């Protein structure tokens, strides 16, 4: 909830951190991915990938990343603040957020999360304590046809219950990984009650082609 | 402990439109003057799109 | 032709929607993608931009701009700089999830979108800005793009043709702001989301500078297929510079919420009882819908009897068109606490460059949320009103003009609910 950062001794430039050979390799994939004379374009990601080193963003991530890519380190501090993806607090192993825009609490959401914060026995924003589940709250998330829905790390589940979110957070606790589909009926985003449109089989190549091509 | 003076015309400044109408009032009083000249601002070139140039050094750095 | 609707699965022009086909190459390419893609890349960029303009296709984000003028708008001799096209699939908008779909679904129809655009503006390579939360959407796009490399279809001589394109997939970080194409722009060439000011237009500085054209991905995945079937094809649906078929996200209070492809100028009320399922508890029970996602106003069931559901009817009724994205909201619903909601996100949502936004939406959210709870005088709802007019058209972005509109919309519609909340709550609380 702040946006500066003061030294702690969890968190400092002096903490260490490194990339492995292998993220090395995938970092000058990345750099080469775009123009030269525009390495700062490579910036986005990389920093992204040290959040996949290492969960969390503390500030030895923004130093080497700046370092690595030849930018000033304010510029990388500039987007891992803008962004709501970089995590720079230590969040629990399995980061959990629930939508409640407008389309999502319309079909209850609030059901489901208070059934996940009387289940996990926290707070909105707080960590379970043994470091297992962080539950936030954020915006649309590209599932409104099938809400209410939550994300699990990378994790989308969607059409959710309470029975099904408790059922969710009992077999994640027990070290197991779910299945990242909507729990209802329909599969991705087909009507509930059966196929209103393409029934037929598809046509195939070849089919209401123009003279001259 | 104020600031006391002793000179009268240390709260004398006058406004005048023109350059000539000043030099003449100075000579016309017998003042001993002289004159600065008009320091006006260049015609700067100023250009949205140069933050954003391909290759040019003028880009800007964060926005 | 005068009933518009009931579209047929031979004129759908997104099949395996609901994916229950394979993805793959092997599937696509027997769904009729890929198919002579060749004689398309050589025929000619005059050619192309001629058939798309012939077809009357306009902009499938939501921003209404005809797409053949638009992609025409590159097709000029270069100054020693390359081209580049970039597809828009960032899709933050509440109600819109039409491009998940497609880039989940058909990943080999939007890379063949982007050679044939490429092609048509004379473009050196492609990105696809992806959403960051859309992983597993974005790994299918990079397995179906490694899968039109191995065969041949892109990179160098793509198609048998002679011409190199290239594709990109970049992943965002979690904004909405990214979906505005310069603050897309301004995201890929590495700093914070943060939108440009046209002029100068993306035609001209692009990203690194480079002229630079920004399409959606429902705009670009239907350019082979309308190469192929012909303009008039695309323009034997809808009415008159309304041409064409269209995505339609309907949620909300409603028995069935889905994604289903229809016509243009299909009526609201056919399609949300045909697909949708009906509003829950009759038609009767309903009470609003927002026939355009977060950025449009909303409409009550006095005009949601015979409205057309294409630009020109939406915008003769006070309102847009937006993504197609129908959030409904029925009887049951505290409607005022749903705007206040959906200003809270746009809030949550906002670059905060430019002044107006920045703090106007700060202040709507405020009044919005005293208006919920009723703690105001009732003067104080034209006060609002007029805060809108103080947003709308003076910002740098149309992400305060799309918070200004609900908020407009909403007093129009329902200022008698919004004044005897906040006089009941008067009188029961003093
Ligand atoms: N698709 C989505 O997920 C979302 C879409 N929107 C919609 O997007 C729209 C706002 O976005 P914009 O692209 O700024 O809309 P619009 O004002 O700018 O312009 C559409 C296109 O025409 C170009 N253009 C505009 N004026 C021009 C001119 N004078 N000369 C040449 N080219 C010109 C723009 O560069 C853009 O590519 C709104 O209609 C809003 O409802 C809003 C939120 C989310
Ligand atoms: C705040 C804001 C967010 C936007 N988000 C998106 C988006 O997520 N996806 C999208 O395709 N267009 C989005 N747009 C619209 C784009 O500016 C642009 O109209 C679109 O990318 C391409 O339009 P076209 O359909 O004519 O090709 C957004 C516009 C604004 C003002
Ligand atoms: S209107 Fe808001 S989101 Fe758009 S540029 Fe201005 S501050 Fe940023
Ligand atoms: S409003 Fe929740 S996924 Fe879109």
Redo the contacts with the bound molecule.
Sequence with gaps: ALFVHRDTPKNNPETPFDFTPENYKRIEAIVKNYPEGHKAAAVLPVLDLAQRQNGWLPISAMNKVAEILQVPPMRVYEVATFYTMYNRKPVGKYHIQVCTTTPCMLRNSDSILEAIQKKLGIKVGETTPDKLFTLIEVECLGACVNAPMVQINDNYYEDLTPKDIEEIIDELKAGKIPKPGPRSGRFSCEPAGGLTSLTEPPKGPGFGVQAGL | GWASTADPLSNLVLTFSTKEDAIAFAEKNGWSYDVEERKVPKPKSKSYGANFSWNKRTRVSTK | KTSFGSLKDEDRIFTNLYGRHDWRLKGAQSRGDWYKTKEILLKGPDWILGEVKTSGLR?????G?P?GL?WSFMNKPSDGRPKYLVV?A????PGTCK?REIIRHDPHKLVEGCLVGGRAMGARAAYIYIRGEFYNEASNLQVAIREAYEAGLIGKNACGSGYDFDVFVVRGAGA??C???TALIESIEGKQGKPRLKPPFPADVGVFGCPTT????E?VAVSPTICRRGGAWFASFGRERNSGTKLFNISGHVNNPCTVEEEMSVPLKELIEKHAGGVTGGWDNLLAVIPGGSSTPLIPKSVCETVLMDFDALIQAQTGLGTAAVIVMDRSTDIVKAIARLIEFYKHESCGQCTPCREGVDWMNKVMARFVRGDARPAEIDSLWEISKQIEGHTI???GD?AAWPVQGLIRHFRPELEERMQRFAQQHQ
Excluded at chain 3, 59 to 63: H, I, L
Excluded at chain 3, 90 to 93: A, I, M, S, T, V
Excluded at chain 3, 214 to 217: G, K, L, S, Y
């Design positions: 902009g499938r984000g939501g921003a701009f797409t638009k828009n960032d899709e933050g908008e491009d909405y702001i979906g505005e194409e920004v399409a959606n991905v705009t972005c149309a992400l799309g």
